[PDB]
Design a protein around this nucleic acid. Structure first.
Ligand code: MG
Ligand code: MG
Ligand code: MG
Ligand code: MG
Ligand code: MG
Ligand code: MG
Ligand code: MG
Ligand code: MG
Ligand code: MG
Ligand code: MG
Ligand code: MG
Ligand code: MG
Ligand code: MG
Ligand code: MG
Ligand code: MN
Ligand code: MN
Ligand code: MN
Ligand code: MN
Ligand code: MN
Ligand code: MN
Ligand code: MN
Ligand code: MN
Ligand code: MN
Ligand code: MN
Ligand code: MN
Ligand code: MN
Ligand code: MN
Ligand code: MN
Ligand code: MN
Ligand code: MN
Ligand code: MN
Ligand code: MN
Ligand code: MN
Ligand code: MN
Ligand code: MN
Ligand code: MN
Ligand code: MN
Ligand code: MN
Ligand code: MN
Ligand code: MN
Ligand code: MN
Ligand code: MN
Ligand code: MN
Ligand code: MN
Ligand code: MN
Ligand code: MN
Ligand code: MN
Ligand code: MN
Ligand code: MN
Ligand code: MN
Ligand code: MN
Ligand code: MN
Ligand code: MN
Ligand code: MN
Ligand code: MN
Ligand code: MN
Ligand code: MN
Ligand code: MN
Ligand code: MN
Ligand code: MN
Ligand code: MN
Ligand code: MN
Ligand code: MN
Ligand code: MN
Ligand code: MN
Ligand code: MN
Lengths: 44, 89, 269
RNA sequence: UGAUAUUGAAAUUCGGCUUUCUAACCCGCACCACUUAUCGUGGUGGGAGACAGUGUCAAGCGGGCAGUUUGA
RNA sequence: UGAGUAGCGAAAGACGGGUGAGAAUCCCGUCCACCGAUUGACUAAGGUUUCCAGAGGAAGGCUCGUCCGCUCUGGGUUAGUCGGGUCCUAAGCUGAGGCCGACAGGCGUAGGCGAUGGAUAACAGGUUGAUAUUCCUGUACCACCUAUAAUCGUAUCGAUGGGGGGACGCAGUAGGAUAGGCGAAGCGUGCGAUUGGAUUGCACGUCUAAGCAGUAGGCGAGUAAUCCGGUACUCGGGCUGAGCUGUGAUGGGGAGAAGAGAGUCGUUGAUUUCACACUGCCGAGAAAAGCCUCUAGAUAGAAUAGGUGCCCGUACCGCAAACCGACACAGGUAGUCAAGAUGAGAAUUCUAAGGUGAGCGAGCGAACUCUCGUUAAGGAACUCGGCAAAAUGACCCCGUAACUUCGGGAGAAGGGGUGCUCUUUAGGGUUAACGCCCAGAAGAGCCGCAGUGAAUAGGCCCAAGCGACUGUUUAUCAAAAACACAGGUCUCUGCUAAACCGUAAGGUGAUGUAUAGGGGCUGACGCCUGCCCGU
RNA sequence: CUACCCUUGGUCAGGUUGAAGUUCAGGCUGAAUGGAGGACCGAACCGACUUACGUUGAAAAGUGAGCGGAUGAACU
């Protein structure tokens, strides 16, 4: 039984990392939102 | 500078096993080269060269009650000399 | 055209081409190396029109379809066999010493003569422009544009007729039976192309087609109504609606797809 | 599919109909140059031509796709 | 409340001696037992201190706990030469200008990023409580610098530029090596206390990089930004690679036992390790750099010591109690190594190396349920249905039907042998025969109920429907008669092709061009496939 | 996770059958070499046909026993 989620740091940091976040308009918006709530952690 | 590149002398039985075989364990600032550690080892101590081994240490962990947390990273590099004899108690 | 013995129940009917014509040099010349990675998908990664994918790797031939280096005489080095094109194609080395891959018309000995351009040597071998070549010439590899490299006849077995000469452009009969005036500045290679019998080799086994870029195709009569016009209904079912339909709707059993008010409509009959 | 702007010149039947030429417009071709680049920009050379393409309006086709009705 | 109820997560332990306030559970000891193509050895992911030592026992541990992957204190990861960076490119990502776009932004040339691949210069031994191709003992290599220069001076570096090379698929056979395996006639030890024996008992039988030497494979003279490339006319064996062995590394290290400075042989089998090499096959099997060149252009001149060589990773777990599954969970997790007997084997049973005894137990030996084994006579009478269980089983020989698309059906059905001893004795290879392998054939003779005496190895036949077949499918109630399939036919489509995505460019189709490409229907093959012009 | 696909790698013990081609005796037949195939037994590995167990589970799809494919439309 192979569950969903087989971790891999490269792919985790891709699509979910600070850079990939900043690269799109919407990721900047996401970062804005997370920063607005005041999350102790933003992007991975 | 060079006074900043060295940090603190390191005392452990492993460090002592190193002093017994002409090797001196030495905490260092981060981003410093093994080279800058030799330069500093000279300008600070008037002894020189041979090998200057270096390793990194990930920050550890410790709790203080409710507040668990990490320590600072280490950058300890031992240095061994072609000639000289650093010590002070 | 070899006929395989029915040793295995699968593909007992098989027919490989008797590639003795391939003769000289199995390996391809290193003159043509770069590309192509396979891609059934379009750019942007969506599956644009396909029952395509998979298949064996193919290095790209860089055949000199243009015959742009017209002039110096050249002779065949070898006959070979291109995968990316149906026909096997011969190599031909220039007197300059430069070598080039050229499509190989039926016949064609291990040594051969005719070059390109200007000269009127209408007897097999490489293309000559344009208004030239006798009417009724065996004619192939026609260009739709001057110096364009000869877009028309290629494939394996292929043909064309050189009948007619209306001025400005020369008339020609395509293997489809179309008869239209290609411009008379066209390159046009002489004889019938490639293998005469590429079409006679039945594939035999399943997946030999999958050795080619051929994914299996699911009929529209099955599936589900959201997937297809033919979809749905209990059991095996009739087309139902009049005129059998392609996915995305639209009739597909005899409906002309040629564009209204085409630019080349004047130049064909 | 039609009127109409882009959109020109010149010849025939009665402003329409059918041909010809380019200064429009167009090449998912040849050459040059930017440039050690199949993108692009020009430059020529052909190709094609006032149509094609595009905007505006108009008439069809259109369960491909959408919102829905389908009584007590 | 249910209730002191269900449960306490596959598994073999017993005792003795320690420790301690307290032991079924901790440590030590003997024996016993389990895995041993693995429950061992090494690593990649991923996890991030779980690693180590000393202390602790409230909680975590499905019991206990003196113990821990838990707690407190202190400490552990050392590299020019290993993996990655200072090297190269693929898919893809990004994309200066640029083309498109209501905006937001999409697309894209040059160029850049990007390993899962190409290229890349060290080995062996030693050592700690925790590291080691990283520390050090020894012996090497690569780059660079600086000091001496035999030989060249309007030789030497050669391009981001054309050359060459790197540069490749899939299958199959034989052979050369090499590791590891097996037995003896040197070599360390012991010599039995249960009847017997003493050429008898067990254990071992090495050494690396580089660096010297030598070995199955592959194949010229001269003329037309360059003397190389390519192209063609006369003229009869050595250029490239290369496993591995001999030597020197070494008078070193390594080693077996024990009484407080020691051996390197011989025969034998023999790889999936060393060649995409070779051969055969068609489905026709990456790119770029390092490297070698030839010039374009640069620059005075380009074996013996000293010295220089950075950043990241390095602990520990990694078929698991430390990874993904909420758990110290019977599931999932790439790769490498893989010994003995038996065998065709990586099957089978028992054992090496090495690991483990499974985080509740003591009793009793009721029903009932589970997992095993056996059962008189009968033998499908059971049941929706032979479901389940039985029976079949290896190897050598003999013998095999209807049918057939001649391949097949076929292990058809089925028939016989199989153990140990002793003789004559005959093939294979290896070697001067000797002996070493492996392995038949005949004859007598022995013992048991039974001889592939264990474990592991096909039940078969008759007839019908459906589908030709291998294959695919509803992850988690349907594997089929469903989809696919090769074959067939219809239809579109002349190349900015049709069809298709975005209709914006751009792109698939396709670097293809009617022997091609899209769609519909059918679905091997055989014999065919008729009657009828509202939509 | 999963479905297709694009690059780039890796795995598949062992036994068996004997296509073409080639070679001697033949006017397309016996013997040898030869090594084909979505070929045949059968581990690794991949699957899920039957059954039993499990059903407030060891487990939100499993376990035992048998079963299908295993050089390929293979597995990853
Ligand atoms: Mg190395
Ligand atoms: Mg890179
Ligand atoms: Mg294991
Ligand atoms: Mg446990
Ligand atoms: Mg054996
Ligand atoms: Mg224990
Ligand atoms: Mg009990
Ligand atoms: Mg029995
Ligand atoms: Mg019935
Ligand atoms: Mg027989
Ligand atoms: Mg038989
Ligand atoms: Mg019936
Ligand atoms: Mg499945
Ligand atoms: Mg377009
Ligand atoms: Mn939050
Ligand atoms: Mn960070
Ligand atoms: Mn380091
Ligand atoms: Mn359906
Ligand atoms: Mn529909
Ligand atoms: Mn229908
Ligand atoms: Mn019906
Ligand atoms: Mn509707
Ligand atoms: Mn509404
Ligand atoms: Mn009602
Ligand atoms: Mn009780
Ligand atoms: Mn109790
Ligand atoms: Mn009760
Ligand atoms: Mn009870
Ligand atoms: Mn109980
Ligand atoms: Mn337990
Ligand atoms: Mn005890
Ligand atoms: Mn005591
Ligand atoms: Mn013990
Ligand atoms: Mn520990
Ligand atoms: Mn407890
Ligand atoms: Mn490196
Ligand atoms: Mn780009
Ligand atoms: Mn821009
Ligand atoms: Mn690019
Ligand atoms: Mn790599
Ligand atoms: Mn360790
Ligand atoms: Mn004894
Ligand atoms: Mn005695
Ligand atoms: Mn380690
Ligand atoms: Mn769970
Ligand atoms: Mn587990
Ligand atoms: Mn697996
Ligand atoms: Mn074995
Ligand atoms: Mn086993
Ligand atoms: Mn052991
Ligand atoms: Mn009975
Ligand atoms: Mn009986
Ligand atoms: Mn009976
Ligand atoms: Mn019966
Ligand atoms: Mn009954
Ligand atoms: Mn009955
Ligand atoms: Mn049964
Ligand atoms: Mn039989
Ligand atoms: Mn079937
Ligand atoms: Mn299902
Ligand atoms: Mn099922
Ligand atoms: Mn748009
Ligand atoms: Mn098979
Ligand atoms: Mn099951
Ligand atoms: Mn099973
Ligand atoms: Mn099988």
């Amino acid at each position: 039984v192979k569950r969903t989620y087989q971790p891999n740091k490269r792919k985790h940091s891709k699509v979910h990392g600070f850079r990939k976040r900043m690269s799109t308009k919407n990721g900047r918006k996401v970062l804005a939102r997370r920063r607005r709530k005041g999350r102790k952690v933003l992007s991975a | 500078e060079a006074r900043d590149i060295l940090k603190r002398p390191v005392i452990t039985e492993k460090s002592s096993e190193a002093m017994a075989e002409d090797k001196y364990t030495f905490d260092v600032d981060t981003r410093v080269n093994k080279t800058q550690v030799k330069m500093a080892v000279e300008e600070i101590f008037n002894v020189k060269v041979a090998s200057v081994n270096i390793m990194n240490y990930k920050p550890k962990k410790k709790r203080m009650g409710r507040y668990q947390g990490y320590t600072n990273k280490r950058r300890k590099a031992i240095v061994t000399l072609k000639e000289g004899s650093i010590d002070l108690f | 055209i070899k006929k395989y013995k029915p040793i295995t129940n699968g593909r007992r009917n098989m027919t490989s081409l008797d590639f003795a014509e391939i003769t000289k040099t199995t390996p391809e010349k290193s003159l043509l190396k770069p590309l192509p990675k396979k891609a059934g998908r379009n750019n942007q990664g969506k599956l644009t029109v396909r029952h395509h994918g998979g298949g064996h790797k193919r290095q790209y031939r860089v055949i000199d379809f243009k015959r742009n280096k017209d002039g110096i005489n050249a002779k065949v080095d070898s006959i070979q066999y291109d995968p990316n094109r149906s026909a096997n194609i011969a190599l031909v080395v220039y007197a300059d010493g430069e070598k080039r891959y050229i499509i190989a018309p039926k016949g064609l000995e291990v040594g051969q003569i005719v070059e390109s351009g200007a000269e009127a040597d209408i007897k097999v071998g490489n293309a000559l422009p344009l208004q030239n070549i006798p009417v009724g010439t065996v004619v192939h590899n026609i260009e739709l544009k001057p110096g364009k490299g000869g877009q028309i006849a290629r494939s394996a077995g292929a043909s064309a007729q050189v009948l007619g000469k209306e001025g400005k452009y020369v008339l020609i009969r395509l293997r489809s039976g179309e008869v239209r005036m290609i411009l008379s500045t066209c390159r046009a290679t002489i004889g019938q192309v490639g293998n005469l019998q590429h079409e006679l080799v039945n594939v035999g086994k399943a997946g030999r087609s999958r050795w080619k870029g051929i994914r299996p195709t699911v009929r529209g009569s099955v599936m589900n109504p959201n997937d297809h016009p033919h979809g749905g209904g209990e059991g095996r079912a009739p087309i139902g609606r009049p005129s059998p339909m392609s996915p995305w709707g639209k009739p597909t059993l005899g409906k002309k797809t040629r564009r209204g008010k085409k630019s080349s409509d004047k130049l064909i009959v």
